[PDB]
Design a binder for this molecule. Structure first.
Ligand SMILES: NC(=O)C1=CN([C@@H]2O[C@H](COP(=O)(O)OP(=O)(O)OC[C@H]3O[C@@H](n4cnc5c(N)ncnc54)[C@H](O)[C@@H]3O)[C@@H](O)[C@H]2O)C=CC1
Ligand SMILES: NC(=O)C1=CN([C@@H]2O[C@H](COP(=O)(O)OP(=O)(O)OC[C@H]3O[C@@H](n4cnc5c(N)ncnc54)[C@H](O)[C@@H]3O)[C@@H](O)[C@H]2O)C=CC1
Ligand SMILES: [Fe+3]
Ligand SMILES: [Fe+3]
Lengths: 383, 383
């Protein structure tokens, strides 16, 4: 039997954050800790929420120390602020980095045996639910608002570790493209192909079943249809991307992903490479490696990505699916090689071993050897 | 902005009730009240749950007084049992009738100013969440396990009233076809076409949007694909039906239905007509009425029900959707006319006023008049 964890409540559309003050009053919460980053404060995205809270007379404090690929140190800093704030709930404003930091703070506040942070890795044996979290994404992006995962960087051990825990699921998600419009086009592109990686890896993962298949192929269709338009600055395409990224999460949270995520995590740990850019570069290479273990699923992918599949045999449709991803990466200006974003040739053996050991790698439909991964890194390295 | 309420936790597949004892221990609950009907106790369906609970040492009491189209009296009697039981949670075992009774008991128990039951009608102004509900459907299905609605019969006033409350959402749904195999074929047929009615009405409802459209069209594809096989007693078809009826609820709970539900409720109240039979008989007649107000949606319906729409103009595709529902109804042995199920011609004026005043009617893509509804009851009445 298959489990699904989802948000009990989610609001979708431009103006969705408009529902937040009423959700807070109905729940009877007294004071928020807002978990975010300095950029979101600096650009006025956090004010879009706090101005509404002030108008409704709701108490809040703020922690804005979150950095990309958030570290054990960032979690402990935000824990200290939460525990000294007297807040009874959390509001996560931002991408994967603040949302994952917020999940770690909420879990530890109600489960103090785990306050060292690294002991949360894997299926966290938590006794108690998280401090309640209201989750507000600002990237079109990670679906952290709907997943049971969070990823923290262990700086001492040079590794990203995955914490999987139904106790961390947000009580409410607010998916509001008004919070996302300020993303630079390069960030829309990187978070957009991250969402596409989620959708494609989830579609072909080993745990895949009828319900996740239906969410994944819809997510692929929405994202492939909208990403070029959203990068270009189309307001409607931005609204489509906000939904697409979420629908992908509803699936992959519950069944898993594969080798793209497994290979992208070590790049994050070694070089602080943005998650989206690493995923985007690796995706078409990993799809080519997986092609023969995906049944007819690349023909569905090719179709929803606008390839004419009427005539094509399955082998041509598989190759056309991979070429559709190459062409999308080109079109939204993702760098084509790992060397371009600060990877070292010398590191690939260590990267390959960290990828083989990464939990995400287990979901890959083709059994990955150390030797295959080494070769996959070399292929994405350069011409 | 559009809201979605869903189950936070759901288990799917034959054996899913296997997960119940672990879920209870992790939540720390001390004592269940099981809400069910005498048929489900007698047939050994409730024993599929209680034998696992007895083996794990989990305490339970039972209220088995639920009747089809549950009444104010069934709610008040169940409430009395829950209060005297010392139970701290509810397990709903059955179709829409016990699941709707269980929602009512759980709400009133934590919001005792509603113990009259009548005052719950509409958007219930409840301050507290329901007593925690674990929901186990035995039909395929009303999707009551994942909706925020419950329907009670007021005997004194000869009317079914709809209670809509996010506070009533079950904490866990267990969707296990092993709990549904014992349905007689005629019960599989009627609850199956009720699920189809949910999916088709939800697909074309005024409030419809991108996410509910994706859920509803997948539900129609699954249900139209499986129902004949399930009624005929195919094991896999039964498992597909369990999933399809649920996916239908994920959508229609959040956006609404239409005139089929509006015209079915008064038949329930006047004659105690089974909900699924009334919907099955009315569905194709209301689809024919609505056809011009559904854009290209009947082409999608016709395609996923196995009609070859490639050549067809829109008028042939719309007719093809209607005829495919008439054909499914005949194939699974649903009676074609309301006269066959105990409706009286004399009552049609009173039924039509009840239907026009029903909350579900407001969702219909075509604005219904009293005269249009009278004409629709006559058309479904006889040859
Ligand atoms: N929880 C899960 O299941 C998953 C976790 N992740 C994690 O999420 C992280 C990546 O998160 P992302 O959302 O890609 O980025 P991020 O949260 O790391 O932010 C990247 C940068 O964009 C800025 N930014 C974000 N929204 C902005 C906006 N609206 N306008 C202007 N600037 C904005 C941020 O301040 C930051 O400098 C990684 O640590 C990754 O491992 C990724 C996917 C799955
Ligand atoms: N809450 C909601 O969103 C919705 C509410 N409803 C309500 O649900 C009710 C209809 O519920 P249904 O599930 O159609 O029927 P039901 O729960 O009224 O059951 C009909 C009969 O079938 C029997 N039965 C149930 N499961 C069985 C099994 N596995 N084996 C043998 N017999 C079995 C029951 O004992 C009963 O005698 C109506 O009151 C309707 O208004 C219907 C749809 C949506
Ligand atoms: Fe990712
Ligand atoms: Fe119904």
């Amino acid at each position: 039997a298959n489990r699904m964890i989802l948000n009990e409540t989610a609001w979708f559309g431009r103006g969705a954050v408009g529902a937040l003050t009423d959700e807070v009053k109905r729940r009877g919460y007294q004071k928020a800790l807002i978990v975010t980053d300095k950029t979101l404060v600096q650009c006025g995205v956090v004010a879009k929420v706090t101005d509404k809270m002030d108008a409704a007379g709701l108490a809040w404090a703020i922690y804005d120390g979150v950095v990309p690929n958030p570290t054990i140190t960032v979690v402990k800093e935000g824990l200290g602020v939460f525990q000294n704030s007297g807040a009874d709930y959390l509001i996560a404003i931002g991408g994967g980095s603040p949302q994952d930091t917020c999940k770690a703070i909420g879990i530890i506040s109600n489960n103090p045996e785990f306050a060292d942070v690294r002991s949360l890795e894997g299926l966290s044996p938590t006794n108690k639910p998280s401090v309640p979290i209201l989750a507000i994404p600002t990237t079109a992006g990670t679906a952290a608002e709907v997943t049971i995962n969070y990823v923290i960087t262990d700086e001492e051990k040079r590794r990203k570790f995955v914490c999987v825990d139904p106790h961390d699921i947000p009580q409410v998600a607010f998916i509001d493209a008004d919070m996302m419009d300020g993303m630079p086009p390069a960030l829309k592109a990187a978070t957009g192909v991250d969402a596409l990686t989620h959708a494609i890896e989830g579609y072909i993962t080993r745990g895949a079943w009828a319900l996740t298949d239906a969410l994944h192929i819809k997510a692929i269709e929405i994202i492939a249809g909208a990403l070029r338009g959203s990068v270009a600055g189309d307001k409607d395409a931005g609204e489509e991307m906000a939904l697409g990224q979420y629908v992908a999460g509803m699936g992959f949270s519950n069944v898993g992903v594969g080798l793209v995520h497994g290979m992208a995590h070590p790049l994050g740990a070694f070089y602080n490479t943005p998650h989206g850019v690493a995923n985007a570069i690796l995706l078409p290479h990993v799809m080519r490696y997986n092609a023969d273990f995906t049944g007819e699923k690349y023909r569905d992918i090719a179709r929803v990505m606008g390839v004419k599949v009427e005539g094509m045999g399955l082998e041509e449709a598989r190759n056309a699916a991979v070429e559709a991803v190459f062409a999308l990466n080109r079109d939204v200006g993702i760098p084509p090689h790992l060397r371009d974003v600060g990877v070292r040739k010398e590191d690939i053996p260590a990267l390959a071993q960290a990828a083989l050991d990464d939990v995400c790698t287990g979901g890959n439909p083709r059994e990955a050897t150390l030797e295959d991964i080494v070769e996959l890194y070399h292929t994405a390295w350069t011409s």
